[PDB]
Write a protein that binds this ligand. Structure first.
Ligand SMILES: [Co+2]
Ligand SMILES: [Co+2]
Length: 277
């Protein structure tokens, strides 16, 4: 039997743009259950993340006044975000086409799935939801270096699309914005949204001897596969957000062509030139 997935179920009776896929955030659709689920997830992460999340992330939560007790009003959040870095969040139905996603980031709009996981899915949801997209991704947009990195990433979509290289950019996004670590004098910390919204990947990625922690390298990352349904086997570590922005400086086109005829590293592989931490 095939049943409708959660994205389909949540969006019944709603619409979105055929070209850019946004909709007004549907506040009427959040039930008391949703606000309680949000509050529980927020509480859970706020207990776990001190000393694990990077300090910029924690400060972003407070500066943006992300509600602890209810799903946030995107419009209210935007007032603070816009004044900080000129970015805004836009509501989308769920996963959107790549070219639309890049056009959004290139224009300083960050797409956020509007709906929330059901209470029985508190521990984990496969598809992004509003807790992962808002709590996980948005606080760092207050940081001008990180915000400029996302904008530069977005701007690179047109070239990647023209060259059949969108999956190579997707690897960069996955291993930085979703699953990145940052080294600090206080020790390793987390900036990746997929880790920051997780029940326990925050514990594994810093505490476990199992995953590889490898120094950031652009070419290596764009040649590295990832899986979506397990903890990461490798995490890439930056020294500063400036390193990410600076990595977007060169022309990616010759990098894409050289990678196009390479075999990619598996998610668990250690490459010969890896700086292993
Ligand atoms: Co549709
Ligand atoms: Co994400």
């Amino acid at each position: 039997f095939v049943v409708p997935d959660i994205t389909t179920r949540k969006n019944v009776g709603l619409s979105h743009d055929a070209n850019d896929f946004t909709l007004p955030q549907p506040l009427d659709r959040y039930s008391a259950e949703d606000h309680a689920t949000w509050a529980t997830l927020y509480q859970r992460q706020c207990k776990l993340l001190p000393g694990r999340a990077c300090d910029e992330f924690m400060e972003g939560l407070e500066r943006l006044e992300v509600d602890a007790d209810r799903v946030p009003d995107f419009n209210k959040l935007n007032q603070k975000l816009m004044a900080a870095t000129g970015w805004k969040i836009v509501a989308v139905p769920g996963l959107i086409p790549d070219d639309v996603f890049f056009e959004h980031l290139a224009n300083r709009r960050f797409p956020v799935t509007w709906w929330l996981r059901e209470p029985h899915q508190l521990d984990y949801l496969q598809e992004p939801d509003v807790f992962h997209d808002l709590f996980g991704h948005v606080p760092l947009l207050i940081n001008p270096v990180f915000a400029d990195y996302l904008e530069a990433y977005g701007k690179g979509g047109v070239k990647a699309k023209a060259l059949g290289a969108l999956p190579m950019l997707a690897r960069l996004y996955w291993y930085t914005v979703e699953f990145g670590l940052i080294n600090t004098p206080a020790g390793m910390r987390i900036y990746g949204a997929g880790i920051l919204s997780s029940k326990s990947e925050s514990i594994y990625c810093l505490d476990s001897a199992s995953p590889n922690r490898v120094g950031f390298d652009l070419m290596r990352i764009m040649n590295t596969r990832y899986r979506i349904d397990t903890f990461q086997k490798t995490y890439f570590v930056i020294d500063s957000f400036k390193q990410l922005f600076d990595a977007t400086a060169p022309d990616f086109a010759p990098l894409y062509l050289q990678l196009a005829d390479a075999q990619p590293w598996g998610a668990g592989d250690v490459a010969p030139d890896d700086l292993v931490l």
